[PDB]
């Protein structure tokens, strides 16, 4: 199989829900239903800057030489700051210093696990390949984005994450990785008829709620909820089965950093697992890093010593489209940078 050789995050200072309420960015009803405590917010740091910083951390920990990094993939879900510019080449220039292929991979909030899929294949496609770097980075600022209200129920963070995947060795083994696609749901996140062509553009601003309501009215709530539930179930069961494990075999579940209401509907009141078995407390203080959530969550569990050698971790990620990815990761040893 493949190994996680390194990982890291770069998170700008948090803004608390209390500060957000006082600043008017946020209403009480939303604070209450999401149960968020705080979210990382950048000042001047741009998406690729934060990704390269996380990447520098992940690479240092991995100890992998630049020449053994055979691919760089940068994932993100929002504007990277400069049109017709190569943010992955920035990540490569600053964090890696080598000349392998560097490109972007996007799959909305599932982008990190999507990049992991392509990185796994790339490493397996040739016998001499060693490692791949995956990064994520996003800066969810005005004018085009409202971290509290553009997609109500999820509060968006600024920051970067990174993971080093390796065929040679590492502190954890990737026991399975399964990705599920249900493209009938793609219209849920755009204008135009759900089952026809998209409408004309909308750069500022992001308003996901209206598009969802329109989708549901056309396809029906029954259809929408059932297709979403089914896709999530396929990813879970596929990943667990591929790893020879059941959900009871899992010590910690890395969930997306969504608000409480969404996490309860999707996971807690569905799978009947307890919050303490998940990254809920970490996520509710961090915010949604898009495709980066499973990397940030795994890094936190490992870094804080909350995952022990021999224990299995389940990564859970979902993106508009829809796409789902689940992965089972086995911790082999506590890395030197952990507690």
Question: Across the strands, what pairs with 132?
Answer: 71, 165
Q: Give which of a copy of itself, ligand 42X, none residue 48 binds (C-beta under 5 to 8 Å, depending on kind).
A: a copy of itself
How many residues make up the chain in this entry? 339
Residue (of 138, 11, 125) closest to 74 by Cα position: 138
Minimum CB separation of residue 215 from a copy of itself in Å reads: 11
DSSP string, 206-261: --HHHHHHHHHHHH-HHHHHHHHHHHHHHHHHHHHHHTT--GGGEEEEE-----HH
Please identify, among the stretches 173-181, 194-202, 275-283, 314-322, the one whose residues bind ligand 42X according to the rule CB under 6 A.
314-322
Enumerate residues 61-90 that contact ligand 42X by CB under 6 A. 77, 84
The entry of a copy of itself, ligand 42X, none that residue 213 binds, CB within 5 to 8 Å by partner kind: none
Which residue's CB is nearer to ligand 42X, number 54 or number 266?
Answer: 266
Binding at 224: pick from a copy of itself, ligand 42X, none (beta carbon under 5-8 Å per type): ligand 42X
The verdict on 155 binding ligand 42X (CB under 6 A) reads no
Q: Edge-to-edge, what's the strand order for the sheet holding 172-181?
A: 69-75, 131-138, 159-166, 2-10, 172-181, 323-331, 312-319, 250-254
Q: Centre a 10 Å sphere on the Cβ of residue 17 and count the other Cβ atoms it contains.
A: 24
Q: Is 58 in the site for ligand 42X (CB under 6 A)?
A: no
Q: What is the DSSP letter of 304?
A: T
Contact yes or no for 172/310 (Cβ under 8 A): no
CA distance 11 to 40: 6
Interface positions, 108-127, toward a copy of itself (CB under 8 A) = 108-109, 111, 114, 117-118, 120-122, 124-126
Contact yes or no for 125/61 (Cβ under 8 A): no
Told to check if 89 binds a copy of itself by CB under 8 A, we report yes
- C-alpha to C-alpha distance for 13 and 159, rounded to whole angstroms: 10
Pattern of binders to a copy of itself over 167-196, x per CB under 8 A? Answer: ------------xxxxxxxxx-xxx-----
Q: Is 337 in the site for a copy of itself (CB under 8 A)?
A: no
Q: For a copy of itself, which residue of 206, 243, 263, 301 counts as binding (CB under 8 A)?
A: 206
Q: Work out how close the CB of 139 gets to a copy of itself at its nearest, in angstroms, rounded to a whole number.
A: 8
Residues 263-282 that bind ligand 42X (CB under 6 A): 266
CB of 152 to a copy of itself, least distance (A): 13
Rounded CA gap, 180 and 241, in Å?
14
The residues in 21-60 that bind a copy of itself, with binding defined as CB under 8 A, are 44-46, 48-49
Residue 318: which of a copy of itself, ligand 42X, none does it interact with, CB under 5 to 8 A by kind?
Answer: ligand 42X
Angstrom distance (rounded) from CA 55 to CA 136: 9
> Minimum distance between the CB of residue 51 and a copy of itself, rounded to whole angstroms?
11
CB 111 within 8 A of CB 290: yes
Which residues of the shown chain bind ligand 42X in the complex (CB under 6 A)?
A: 77, 84, 108-109, 151, 153, 188-189, 208, 212, 224-225, 228, 262, 266, 318-320
């Amino acid at each position: 199989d493949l190994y996680v050789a390194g990982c890291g995050v770069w998170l700008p200072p948090p803004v608390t829900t209390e500060q957000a309420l006082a600043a008017g960015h946020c209403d009480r009803r939303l604070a209450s239903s999401t149960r968020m405590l705080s979210v990382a917010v950048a000042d001047k740091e741009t998406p690729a800057e934060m990704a390269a910083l996380a990447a520098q951390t992940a690479l240092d920990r991995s100890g992998v030489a630049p020449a053994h990094v055979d691919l760089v993939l940068h994932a993100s879900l929002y504007f990277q700051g400069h049109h017709l510019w190569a943010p992955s080449s920035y990540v490569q220039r600053v964090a890696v210093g080598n000349r392998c292929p560097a490109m972007e991979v996007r799959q909305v909030s599932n982008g990190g696990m999507a990049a992991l899929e392509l990185a796994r294949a790339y490493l397996l496609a040739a016998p001499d390949r060693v490692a791949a770097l995956i990064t994520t980075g996003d800066r969810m600022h005005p004018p085009g984005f409202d971290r509290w209200s553009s997609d109500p129920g999820t509060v968006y963070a600024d920051g970067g994450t990174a993971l080093v995947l390796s065929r040679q060795g590492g502190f954890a083994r990737l026991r399975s990785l399964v990705t599920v696609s249900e493209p009938v749901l793609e219209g849920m996140h755009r204008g135009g008829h759900p089952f026809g062509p998209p409408s004309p553009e909308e750069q500022r601003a992001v308003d996901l709620d209206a598009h969802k309501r329109a989708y549901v009215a056309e396809a029906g709530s029954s259809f929408s909820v059932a297709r979403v539930s089914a896709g999530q179930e396929e990813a879970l069961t596929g990943a667990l089965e591929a790893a020879g494990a059941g959900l009871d075999d899992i010590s910690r579940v890395v969930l997306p950093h969504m608000g409480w209401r969404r996490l309860s509907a999707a996971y807690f009141n569905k799978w009947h697992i307890q919050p303490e078995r998940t990254t809920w407390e970490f996520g509710r203080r961090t915010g949604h890093l898009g495709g980066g959530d499973p990397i940030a969550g795994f890094d936190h569990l490992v870094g804080s010593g909350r995952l022990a050698p021999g224990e299995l971790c389940l990564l859970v990620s979902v993106g508009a489209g829809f796409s789902w990815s689940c992965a089972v990761v086995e911790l082999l040893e506590r890395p030197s940078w952990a507690a």
